[PDB]
Write a protein that binds this ligand. Structure first.
Ligand SMILES: Nc1cc(-n2ccnc2)c2cc(O)cc(O)c2n1
Length: 124
């Protein structure tokens, strides 16, 4: 049984649009999305479909690029740092659930390096 996915809207949370958050959607997320190793990370982990019944017994703060994308489209974040923290949660979850050298880990590590290159310089 999968948990509910992370929220992509919250009326109690203030919204904001910044140049940096626009960039994280238009440039960073949409470039990572096209990477050959992006597909495992484009939606929440379906533990039922993927036959990973222990996934959410281990990962208690799930995050994925589909959720991040919807948050960016919703102007859900206050600032770029909040969105960057969601990317880092996504990568860290993969490294927690899996072991060094696993195929999925190699995929996450390549995306993380590309992510860090793209956010090295943000607009002002
Ligand atoms: N051991 C695995 C297998 C995955 N997977 C398997 C088939 N498709 C994705 C997987 C997918 C993710 O988004 C994150 C993970 O931490 C995963 N870990």
């Amino acid at each position: 049984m999968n948990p509910p996915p992370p929220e992509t809207s919250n009326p109690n949370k203030p919204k904001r649009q910044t140049n940096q958050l626009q960039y994280l959607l238009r440039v960073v997320l949409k470039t990572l999305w096209k990477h050959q190793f992006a597909w495992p990370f484009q939606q929440p982990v379906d533990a039922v479909k993927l036959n990973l019944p222990d996934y959410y017994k281990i990962i208690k703060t799930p995050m994925d690029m589909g959720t991040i994308k919807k948050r960016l489209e919703n102007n859900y974040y206050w600032n770029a740092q909040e969105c960057i923290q969601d990317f880092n949660t996504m990568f860290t979850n993969c490294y927690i659930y899996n072991k060094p050298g696993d195929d999925i880990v190699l995929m996450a590590e390549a995306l993380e390096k590309l992510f860090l290159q793209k956010i090295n310089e943000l607009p002002t």
